[PDB]
Amino acid sequence: PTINQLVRKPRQSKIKKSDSPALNKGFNSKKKKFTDLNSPQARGVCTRVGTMTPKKPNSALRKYARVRLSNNIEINAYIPGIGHNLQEHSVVLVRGGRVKDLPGVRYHIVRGALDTSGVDGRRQGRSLYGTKKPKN
Amino acid sequence: ARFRGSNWKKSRRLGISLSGTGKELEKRPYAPGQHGPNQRKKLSEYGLQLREKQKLRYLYGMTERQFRNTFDIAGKKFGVHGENFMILLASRLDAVVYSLGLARTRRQARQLVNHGHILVDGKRVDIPSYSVKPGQTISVREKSQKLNIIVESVEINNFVPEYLNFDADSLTGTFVRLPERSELPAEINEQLIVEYYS
Amino acid sequence: AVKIRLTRLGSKRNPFYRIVVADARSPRDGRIIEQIGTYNPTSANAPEIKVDEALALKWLNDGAKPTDTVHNILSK
Amino acid sequence: TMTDPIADMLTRVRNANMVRHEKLELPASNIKKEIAEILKSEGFIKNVEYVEDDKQGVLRLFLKYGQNDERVITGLKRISKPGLRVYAKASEMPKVLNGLGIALVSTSEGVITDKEARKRNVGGEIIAYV
Amino acid sequence: RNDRKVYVGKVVSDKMDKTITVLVETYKTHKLYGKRVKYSKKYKTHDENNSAKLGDIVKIQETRPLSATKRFRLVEIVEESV
């Protein structure tokens, strides 16, 4: 507004918040690295084999994996692709991005470098799922 | 970085009948693939500057990183960034080879440069994207007369520009002046080029 | 006082110098006081000696220790 | 109360042009006797008189129109009003509509136009536009 | 000492021996909003024999340090009014 008021208080701009909460900050030090920052990726360790549904009008079935992350906290997940060589308490790489119409799930289990290593059943969409073909 | 594959898909699917991947045509009722008078023709409002970006990119055989790195070489000229870009594409060593009639395409003009058979001022220049500065000439090495493919270009005269001295069999040239438009091209405005880059 | 120095610059496999002067307390790479001009080590497509003795005599008055291979510039 | 009446003069320039009036009777002083006699030598007003008594003498304005009863003055914009002061650079004051109008500056020499400042590179307060 | 900078300003209060505070005015321009703004640092000043009173306009020279903020040195009396 008035140039008198703008001297007396500047434009304190709009804060934003992260779309994906449970990563990427200095958390809660407890004389060791009790919890840390994972900007793109991490390890995991699993806790539960997941089976769930979307909720809005949709009626399909989905297979998450409710884990405890490497910084004491609890998140859901998802395995893209077909195969599932995963059981309880097995290491899984992470990468962010929510899943719409599921009520509370958080990230994608990377199908390349983990115990989630390689998914067969795919032949054209490949590097999104970690499937090889050394002929070409 | 080089474009290979002499199939007519560069001419027929773009549309223009230039001297690129095959000077003739044989499946003239159709476009490539099942795209044809049968099936979907996908047009756009940004495809009118796409096809003045895609119309040149296969012509010299250049990648995407080359044009943007040459779009702002015309920024060093006192004309605007879209005004002298076709001049700097007309001043490269590759299209001056075909302008001297020493090769038979612009792509055959890049084959006989890197393999040492065409030089500049005696010193071995083997760069197809070499900028011909004014006041320089065109050279060869001592083994350039035995080859049939230069003698192929001695058989047939191909293309005459206006900014050179024209020697189709002597294998030495002269860059007398900086070019202008409609000497090397014939069909492209300098106004649909620049709008793609914004 | 001060010591006459050649700041080495230059990329891989190609050094190049700039004639400077500062105390030995100052290092080679930087905190250099003045520059009396460049110096040209390689001689192919390049000169071989370069100096400007106008502001070089300003430093031989208050004291200067040229290194014994730099003194071959100013002997010529 | 009435703060900076120089804008109130240039308000009534816009008022009479809009409803297409002829006679404009405003009080004005030696600040504004320097003002409107710029544009008479620039082509906006038919005739500007002088103030009668230099304090309470009203300066009558008879505005200039076109032959088609078409408007000559498009609009007006104050620049340096009380609360934000604008002063001109050396040769870097801006142009009105790519040079087609008068930007009024009162430099260290008196009220001139933005054309006359580029012969002596002066700054001064950029008062109004056209 | 003999040639130091000068901050002429009003004398606020003589409250102890050999000590006053001589306030000055400084209008500072803002970074981007353009409109100037006042800031008035109130610097303490040694004076020789309680020569100042409340309200004087003076002339100030610097010195070499004495104590906490007693860093200036009064010279003149431009105005001796109240």
Place this chain on the structure above:
Amino acid sequence: EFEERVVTINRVAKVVKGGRRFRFTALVVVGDKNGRVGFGTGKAQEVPEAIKKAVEAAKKDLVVVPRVEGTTPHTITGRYGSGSVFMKPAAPGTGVIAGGPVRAVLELAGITDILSKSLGSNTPINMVRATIDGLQNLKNAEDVAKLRGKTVEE
């Protein structure tokens, strides 16, 4: 002869009250690439037959735009209602940048300039009426030289 483009069409009516209306419309800009443009709106239920009614509505509208052969004479913020485009002259050689409703009007007057973006425009009808309101208010030097001195100002 002129040139036309279909900017937008809609499917606007009320579905069933006991009798169905489901009509279309169009907003066609017409031009000649010499400096005279226009725009008009008609409506019918057979799909491309409302275009011929819409080109019928725009041939009765011509707007003369001054030009220095490639750009505009000065800058202006063409505003109508809730829309506001900004337009400013370029140097010859850079082309007309988009604003799609405002893109196709500036090419049918025949210029090659920059175009600053639609500031507060939302819908493709008020982009068009703010474009034309910008173009019909520019000024020459000669008409200014009528009601002033005779080309002194340089």
Place this chain on the structure above:
RNA sequence: ACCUAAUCAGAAAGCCACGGCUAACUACGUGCCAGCAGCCGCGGUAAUACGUAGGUGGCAAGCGUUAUCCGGAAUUAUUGGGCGUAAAGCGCGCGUAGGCGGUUUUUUAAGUCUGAUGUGAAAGCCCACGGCUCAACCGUGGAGGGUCAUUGGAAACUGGAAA
């Protein structure tokens, strides 16, 4: 570093997409399922919007995905917004500091104006060239800092001072 002479075009190419946006389409299998999803969402009995081959488009020794930051966002708006009903005018007076202050003439130069000097070192971005066979980088020149200190002229408005 360079460079000649040899059996040999023979060793030396991917990767994501292809409803709409947005650049690029077809035939079946499953068929609100294994799924997919940046939003509109395409899936209840194939489905141009899921895996598959064909086809195409993009970039190219590199292609996609993630988390983070700026632009898109005139969506913190000095350059560049808003308050009757959409988010927003204190329930309303006296009122301290503060902000802004009509007209006249004369000084002062505190702002403002321009002149002069010194300084805000290399190196980068840009403005140019012998050269590394071009180029990335080096080389030389060039512009780039003052809301500063100090050194003269002008008195138009804003400001202290006389009527």
